[PDB]
Amino acid sequence: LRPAKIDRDVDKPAYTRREYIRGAPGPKITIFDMGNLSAEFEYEVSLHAEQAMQIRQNALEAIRIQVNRYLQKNVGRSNYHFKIRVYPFQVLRENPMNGMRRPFGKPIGLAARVRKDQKILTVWVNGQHLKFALGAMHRAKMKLPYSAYYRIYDKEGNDVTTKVLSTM
């Protein structure tokens, strides 16, 4: 398939409505929560977008697999509540190539529209796996089209990344 520099920008209108789009495809990604889904952990390691993006589902799935494998091999299912927050709604289209006669693209895939400083994914963990959560952060960051940054969140809604990073 085509490079993501074509689809990372957010300047086109939203194109979501299934009852008017003909030939629209289904999602390749199907799982969005992982691990222990009730354990009431302490720390929330969340990724945020630096600027607005459109992320493809191919990338989303690559991230899913990579991160969950790291976390399962080095933490264990009974910990590490992993979640992907954003669903792919926008339909990507390509012009069936005649030339520019009758150019209006046929559907080829899906992406999720993310705005500036919008949470993409989260890993809830306990005190003694922060380093593995941050490894997941870095692995994910490396597979996105634009830049991102992570925060560490406590209960009560507070940002604690400074000091929690300092002590390690």
Please pick, from the candidates 18, 22, 101, 102, the single residue that binds RNA as defined by CB under 7 A. Answer: 101
Q: Is 100 in the site for RNA (CB under 7 A)?
A: yes
Q: Is 102 in the site for RNA (CB under 7 A)?
A: no
Q: Is 46 left (phi over 0), alpha (psi -120 to 50) or beta?
A: beta
Stretch that binds RNA, among 4-12, 74-82, 83-91, 124-132 (CB under 7 A): 4-12
Please pick, from the candidates 23, 99, 127, 157, the single residue that binds RNA as defined by CB under 7 A. Answer: 99
Please pick, from the candidates 12, 17, 69, 155, the single residue that binds RNA as defined by CB under 7 A. Answer: 69
CA end-to-end distance (rounded Å), the chain: 42
Residue with tokens 């354990």: 39
Which residues lie across from 47 on neighbouring strands?
150
- Closer CB to RNA, residue 10 or residue 41? 10
With contact defined as beta carbons under 8 Å apart, do 110 and 92 qualify?
A: yes
Please pick, from the candidates 8, 85, 119, 151, the single residue that binds RNA as defined by CB under 7 A. Answer: 8
Long-range CB pairs of 12-19 (<8 Å, 24+ gap) are 14/90, 14/113, 15/90, 15/91, 15/93, 16/89, 16/90, 16/91
Contacting residues toward RNA, per CB under 7 A:
1-6, 8, 56, 58-59, 62-63, 66, 69-70, 73, 97-101, 139, 141-147, 162-163, 166-167
